[PDB]
Structure formats: structure tokens, C-alpha cells
Ligand binder design. Structure first.
Ligand SMILES: [Ca+2]
Ligand code: NA
Length: 259
């Protein structure tokens, strides 16, 4: 049930971090859950600091919203920024101070693949507008795994590549005309990249679209509210058909409508 994004709902706060370590972070669910996890399993990473390794795992939504983790994973290498995703049983994350994406299989706590994203800027070269070393943003949509980044050759414009989820090979690449540092974040729905204009405003917008199927770029004016005035992470979950975001300590979700 795909289409163009035409509306974003009000943010709903599901959990609030209680310490500075969670001012920024990433939380997610697996759109292709695999044993022993389910569509309720949630992962949370508080990403302030320089040695981020703890991944909080919750078996049930109730636990994510009110309790302690069911399990804590300690990653073998520190993680960079807020761009990570979970897909088909693995956490895909960027190694700190690198352009390396790592596939970490959660049930075995094993690194199964690593890949430098060719030519990608990293560690503050092509972040989103808030900074935060957000140079490399993973994404899952209806067709699988992607990565959003930029390169010198692209002159800082958003590049996105489809990824093989097993071995992290790049399968196809598209170049937009959207300056990555000029937008607050981005996500992919049904093969179209969308960007958000501001990470602080209550009256931000989803302001650009790039359709990988047609090559066409568009401007948009869909309202987008940053309720807590500092959104560090905005991703799309194609199973729930919702946006998942992190806004100034708060793990929030937005409903959407597609044409
Ligand atoms: Ca994103
Ligand atoms: Na991401």
C-alpha cells in the first residue's frame, strides 16, 4: 500500500530519557522481525558521548514505555551518531570516527559484515543541519535497506544507495540536488527520499522529495512539528507505516498518510 507522502500527524511521546546521555539517540523496531524477536521488540540507543556501546532491548512495547530493558547488548566497537537501523535481525550502525557500516546480528551478538561506504564523508563533513556527526543515515523502507550520505563528488548533495543487507554491497546509487547540511534529517518511503526543513521549529515542513523510480525532485510544504525543539533522528518504519524520531530526550512517533 504505497504512495506519496501527503500528511504527517502530531508527535506522540512514547518514552522520555531521564539523563543527558539520551538528549539525542535512536530507537527502532524491526520491519522484518526474525526469531526470537517480534514486531513488538524495540531497541533504544542513547547516543550522547564518545564511547557509545550500550543497546537497550525490550521484548514488549510495555517494557519500552515503562520498564527496564529485557537485555543490554554491548557493541564491540563504539557507534557514531543517530543514523542506525534494525533490519531482519541485525543492527546496522556506523563505527565511530569512520565511514564503516557494521552489520551486528543481535541474537548471536556477532559482527557479520562490515563495509566502507565508498567516498562517504564522515565525522562532520556532511552532517544534517544540527551537526551531531550525522553524515551517514541508514534507512529501511518497503524495498529493504538503504544508506543516505554525501561525497565530495556530489558536492555535499544527498546521495542514497540501496544496500545488500547480507554483505553490505551497494546495489544502486542515486544523487539528489539537496544539500545534506541544509536539511534537519531525511527518510525514505516507498523509494522516495523526503527531507525535513528544521529540527527546532514547531512549524517545520517536509520540504523536499526525490523519487528514485522517476528521478524527479519536488518541493513540499507538509507540516512537521518538533514538539521539543531538537530532533536528532527521524526515520521511517515501513511495517508500522510511521515515523520514529528522537526529539530532545523524547522518543516520539508520527502517523503519516500516503496518496
Ligand atoms: Ca533518518
Ligand atoms: Na537512520
Amino acid at each position: 500500500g504505497c504512495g506519496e507522502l501527503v500528511w504527517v500527524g502530531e508527535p506522540l511521546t512514547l518514552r522520555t530519557a531521564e539523563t543527558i546521555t539520551g538528549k539525542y539517540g535512536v530507537w527502532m523496531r524491526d520491519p522484518k522481525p526474525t526469531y526470537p524477536y517480534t514486531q513488538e521488540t524495540t531497541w533504544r540507543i542513547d547516543t550522547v558521548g564518545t564511547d557509545v556501546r550500550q543497546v537497550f532491548e525490550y521484548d514488549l512495547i510495555s517494557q519500552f514505555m515503562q520498564g527496564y530493558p529485557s537485555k543490554v547488548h554491548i557493541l564491540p566497537r563504539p557507534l557514531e551518531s543517530t543514523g542506525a537501523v534494525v533490519y531482519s535481525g541485525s543492527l546496522y550502525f556506523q563505527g565511530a570516527e569512520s565511514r564503516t557500516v557494521i552489520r551486528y546480528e543481535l541474537n548471536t551478538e556477532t559482527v557479520k559484515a562490515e563495509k566502507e561506504i565508498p567516498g562517504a564523508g564522515y565525522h562532520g563533513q556532511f552532517p544534517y543541519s544540527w551537526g551531531g556527526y550525522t553524515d551517514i543515515d541508514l534507512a529501511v523502507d518497503e524495498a529493504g535497506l538503504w544508506v543516505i550520505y554525501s561525497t565530495d563528488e556530489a558536492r555535499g548533495a544527498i546521495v542514497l544507495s540501496k544496500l545488500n543487507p547480507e554483505n553490505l554491497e551497494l546495489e544502486q546509487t542515486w544523487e539528489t540536488n539537496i544539500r545534506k547540511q541544509s536539511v534537519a534529517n531525511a527518510f525514505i518511503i516507498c523509494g522516495t527520499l523526503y527531507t525535513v526543513s528544521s529540527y527546532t521549529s514547531a512549524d517545520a515542513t517536509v520540504n523536499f522529495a526525490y523519487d528514485t523510480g522517476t528521478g524527479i525532485s519536488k518541493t513540499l510544504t507538509i507540516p512537521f512539528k518538533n514538539r521539543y525543539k531538537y530532533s536528532s533522528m527521524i526515520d521511517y518504519n515501513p511495517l508500522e507505516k510511521k515515523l520514529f524520531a528522537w526529539d530532545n530526550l523524547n522518543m516520539v512517533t508520527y502517523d503519516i498518510k500516503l496518496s
